[PDB]
Design a protein around this ligand. Sequence first.
Ligand SMILES: *P(=O)([O-])[C@@H](C)NC(=O)CCCC[C@H](NC(=O)C[NH3+])C(=O)[O-]
Length: 345
Amino acid sequence: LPAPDDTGLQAVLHTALSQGAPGAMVRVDDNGTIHQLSEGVADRATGRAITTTDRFRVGSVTKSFSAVVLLQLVDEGKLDLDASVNTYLPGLLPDDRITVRQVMSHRSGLYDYTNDMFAQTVPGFESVRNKVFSYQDLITLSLKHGVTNAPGAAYSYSNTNFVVAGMLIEKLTGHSVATEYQNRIFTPLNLTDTFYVHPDTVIPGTHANGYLTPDEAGGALVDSTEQTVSWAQSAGAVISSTQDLDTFFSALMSGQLMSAAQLAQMQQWTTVNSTQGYGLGLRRRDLSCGISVYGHTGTVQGYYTYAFASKDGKRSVTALANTSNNVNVLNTMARTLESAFCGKP
Ligand SMILES: *P(=O)([O-])[C@@H](C)NC(=O)CCCC[C@H](NC(=O)C[NH3+])C(=O)[O-]
């Protein structure tokens, strides 16, 4: 690979701050050589600087943790990707032809209940932040809507799919998702900054605060740091750090977390758009210099995450800006992958 471009990374972060991120930071693990940059503040009220060791909410990177647990269950003979969801969770879904594989690749047609919750950004956050949902509560909210397409037929990203994933994990193992994440992933990879504390609202240890951008342009930011994330759970509630998500995605892509057969299933790409695919709880992004990278994005209120690795896991990058509902920042932060993998023009 090209050398990572730290001057480019620096410019990305500075641009994100100019667009409304209080803080922005990035870590690259380039085959044993670290790159780390940060600009701005973890807490905008106190002025404390952001750093690459600050913990944060990784959002839908959680779907890749959930997918690794499910694929290990496939390896163990406890789950068949082409069985119907209702085989394991009887009566859950209106159509017994919706399969596990379809849920994990967002081809199930299940409506995303968070489109209702977050039609208005700050009121929707204030509505859910202190609520505790069961898995079933969220499935019922989705099923109030019709499915959006026939089983398997269309890619439509939906958090409901990884709510189903959490239910599957808990039913087939008899354990909570926290216990499964801990035993299967956090402990074996020594992810000392990685937690699943749902429904606790506290972020353990030193962390970036999150700042939700309101829908009104120029409006004051809302501190969104402490919330249950119960609206997402196995679709979005993990806490981690840049070092730990680099460790995780490198371990995944280098073949340490499941059999070769299940990793190949995880990387069967469904088209998202002309530069992106979705596997099983895994994204592919195609970068301008002809390199594809693999991992996941996250958005929860106040936190935008990118965490991606090369195909062989030897280079991994995690970037965080502590705002959300700010597409300028979101688009800018994607450029960290360009600078880190494609290098200098
Ligand atoms: P993942 O990270 O894809 C999953 C856990 N996150 C989402 O689906 C996004 C949730 C909504 C995020 C907020 N947007 C709005 O409220 C839009 N009105 C945001 O914080 O940007």
